[PDB]
Amino acid sequence: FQSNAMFAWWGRTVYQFRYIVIGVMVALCLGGGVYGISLGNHVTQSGFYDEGSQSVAASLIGDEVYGRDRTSHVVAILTPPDDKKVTDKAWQKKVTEELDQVVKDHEDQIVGWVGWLKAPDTTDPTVSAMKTQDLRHTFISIPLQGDDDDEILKNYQVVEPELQQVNGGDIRLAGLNPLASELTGTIGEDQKRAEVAAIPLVAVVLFFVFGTVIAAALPAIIGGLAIAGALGIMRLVAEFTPVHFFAQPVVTLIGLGIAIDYGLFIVSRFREEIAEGYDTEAAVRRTVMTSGRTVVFSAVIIVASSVPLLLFPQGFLKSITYAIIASVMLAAILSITVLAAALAILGPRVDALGVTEEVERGFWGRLVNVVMKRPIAFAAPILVVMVLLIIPLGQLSLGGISEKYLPPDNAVRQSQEQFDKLFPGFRTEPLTLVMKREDGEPITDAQIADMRAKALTVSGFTDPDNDPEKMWKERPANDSGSKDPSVRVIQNGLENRNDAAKKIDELRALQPPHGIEVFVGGTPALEQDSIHSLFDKLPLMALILIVTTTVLMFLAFGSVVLPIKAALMSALTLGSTMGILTWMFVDGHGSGLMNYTPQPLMAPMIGLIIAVIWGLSTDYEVFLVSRMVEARERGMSTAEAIRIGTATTGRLITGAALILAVVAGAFVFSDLVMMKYLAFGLLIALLLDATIIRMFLVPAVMKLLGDDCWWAPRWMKRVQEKLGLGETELPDER
């Protein structure tokens, strides 16, 4: 119930044996880090679709019975070097034999190149389109070998360098696997750059906060240990479910913000409570009780605000949820245990060994004083600004992944766009119409015919032959499928890629000719199904978030109208950050400065942004109001309580904001637009929340609601808040 005896026992226990704990924890965390140093080679770059949807099963049926298509795994554009034509029998033979021998070398992971160069004297109609009219450019296609996406990607990774050098390295590779490889390489480069350009800045700001080196060095060590432990735990959980590759940067971000932050707070409180001549044991006990309590409560708040992501079916969000939970929980545990143990074994030597306040507190006090003299004069402008900064939410369109997630001067994107400009029409996204047999094991003919007749009523579908006789054409059947007489797929493509959903639902509503059943599982179908599922299950997640955070905040300090204020402030900062992000990434303003390209936002990212911004925003309020009510408890009036709370929380919240902002800024400079999106989200939320919200709105709304801030009704207040955790004002003894 009370849990305070538990924290006191934990304190005296940690000091009772403060070598076993540090030993076992450092050993376990280093072992986990060494074991997780191979988290790669096990992260699947897959999962963006509702795995229970209809279109996913459609595509599965299709590529199982017909065999997955490999004509677009890798394409290669070739040009004759000596400014000649493409026929050029000599150069033709040279390139041909080179490709033949390089296929002979790695024959296991290359099914075999095909293209116009193979028998160039052919008269085939479509094969005669792999050459440019001026006979200057040609291209080929190389189908890789594999049974799943990761196998094919690894095969491409191992065959890349041997293929990049052909007829003088003028070959230009494009397709799908180059894009995937470039994205993963971008994630790796992000890790490297963020580490190397965020360790020194964090070290500098830390040393500037404290004034010594050892105290400024402990949080860096615990942050490294937290990163190692989180990587270990993720590698361990990988064997039970696929872990999306987007969980390596999240861990490095949340293990340099949160862990460093917690360590800073704990060491600060210890250095403060040791200034009273206390013995190291009592100092450790007091720090453990108070600061460990607030840190554990912050960790529980973050976990219970990042759990609701488990409602969505996208396999991309569950990995992020597991990463956040694991890293936050391990950071809290490492913080309390190892910090207490290291402080115990160190004691008073945490001030020397590194040699060679009034103005700040006075500033914050003068600030809160001059802003409390009139509430409305500081509550009207900020509120109208943050309610008129939410209007960009009207232009909110979403989409999928393309090659426009890279800087427009990248190598691979330019090659892909060049290939799409030279050779048009060879990049299509059809809408399959797979039909499965209910009755009639062989799907007799003219059934496909009446189904085509049925489907030809929908408009908006392309027709290159300009004739309905060649519309909704069957797809090619590779020699890797079963080719059953029961399933036979037809397909065709549309013209306006944006209005897909309308035609998709119309097709879904069409009545099949007989007991056989229809499906529409194309790629725009996949994307539209993902969008529809996310927007269908978002409101329940929002309500669960609100209820969880409000209820969990009530139990920390009995008051009904404080959770309301916290929820309002969180909703306003969330809406404001969302509006700024939309105006920045969809309206396009500020693009040429940050080197990206305007485009619709990512599909399963509006969930992550919400479930993170709400978390941190309700985390700061939980801390501030906690200090405030601790001050209020004994005999101090409202305004004095607000003043002392803000004065105390000032420097620590500033240091926290600086650490988190420095790490987020070190991540801003990424290439993959999703990283930039998340980083700008975090930075905007952090600054706009902390500075403006806190020190120009919280005192104002508190005073306007003055002295009616604990109205909480007697019955529930007593029976629940008292029978449990409690108020436990810390008693000071001799």
Ligand X SMILES: Cc1c(C(=O)NCCN[C@H]2[C@@H]3C[C@H]4C[C@@H](C3)C[C@@H]2C4)nn(-c2ccc(F)cc2F)c1-c1ccc(Cl)cc1
Nearest approach, Cβ of 218 to ligand X (angstroms)? 15
- Binding of ligand X by 609 (CB under 6 A): no
**Closest CA relative to residue 529, chosen from 53, 169, 158:** 53
343's tokens: 């402080």
Which residues, at least 6 apart from 644, have a Cβ–Cβ distance to it below 8 Å? 631, 636
CB 561, CB 705: distance < 8 Å: yes
With binding defined as CB under 6 A, does residue 253 bind ligand X?
yes
Question: Which stretch, 29-37, 84-92, 658-666, 692-700, contacts ligand X (CB under 6 A)?
Answer: 658-666
Q: Give the nearest distance from C-beta 451 to ligand X in angstroms.
A: 47
Per DSSP, the residues of 459-518 read --B--TTSSGGG-SEEPP--TTS---SS-B-EE--BS-STTHHHHHHHHHHSPPSSS-EE
Binder of ligand X out of 48, 139, 265, 405 (CB under 6 A): 265
Query: Chain centroid to CA 584: how far?
Result: 18
Residue 619 annotated as binding site: yes
Q: Which of 74, 288, 434, 663 binds ligand X (CB under 6 A)?
A: 663
Side chain identity at residue 261, one-letter code: D
Question: Distance between CA atoms of 535 and 312, rounded to whole angstroms?
Answer: 10
Residue with tokens 């993720």: 234
Figure out which of the listed residues 99, 317, 340, 664 binds ligand X, where binding follows CB under 6 A. 664
Nearer to ligand X (CB atom), residue 265 or residue 312: 265
In angstroms, what CA-CA distances link 577 with 12, 267, 597?
A: 44, 32, 20
State which of residues 261, 403, 671, 689 lies at the interface with ligand X (CB under 6 A): 261
* 3-state percent breakdown (helix, strand, coil) of the chain, nearest 5: 65, 5, 30
Is residue 386 involved in binding ligand X (CB under 6 A)?
Answer: no
Q: Is 535 annotated as a binding residue?
A: no
Would you count residue 645 as binding ligand X (CB under 6 A)?
Answer: no
Helix axes 561-585, 606-632, angle to 10 degrees: 150
Tell me how far, at minimum, the Cβ of 354 lies from ligand X, in Å.
Answer: 24
Query: 258, 341, 520, 702: which one contacts ligand X (CB under 6 A)?
Result: 258
The half-sphere exposure of 418 on its side-chain side, counting CA atoms within 13 A, is 19
User: How many residues line the site for ligand X (CB under 6 A)?
Assistant: 25
- Is 48 labelled a binding residue? yes
**Position 406 contacts ligand X (CB under 6 A):** no
| Residue 298 makes contact with ligand X by CB under 6 A | yes
Contact status: 580 vs ligand X (CB under 6 A): no
Does the footprint of ligand X cover residue 623 (CB under 6 A)? yes
Dist. CA 257–CA 328, nearest whole Å = 10
Of 524 and 615, nearer to ligand X (C-beta) is 615
Q: Do 335 and 266 touch, CB atoms closer than 8 A?
A: yes
CA gap 477, 473 in Å, rounded: 12
Q: Does 257 bind ligand X (CB under 6 A)?
A: yes
Nearer to ligand X, 294 or 314 (CB): 294
Applying CB under 6 A, which part among 44-52, 381-389, 483-491, 612-620 lies near ligand X? 612-620
If one asks whether residue 180 binds ligand X (CB under 6 A), the answer comes out as no
Q: How far is CA 200 from CA 204, 217, 220, in A?
A: 6, 12, 10
Whole-angstrom Cα distance, residue 18 to residue 12?
Answer: 10
User: Which of positions 680-709 make contact with ligand X (CB under 6 A)?
Assistant: 682, 686
Give yes or no for residue 556 binding ligand X (CB under 6 A): no
What is the contact surface with ligand X in residues (CB under 6 A)? 250, 253-254, 257-258, 261-262, 265, 294-295, 298, 302, 324, 612, 615-616, 619-620, 623, 656, 660, 663-664, 682, 686
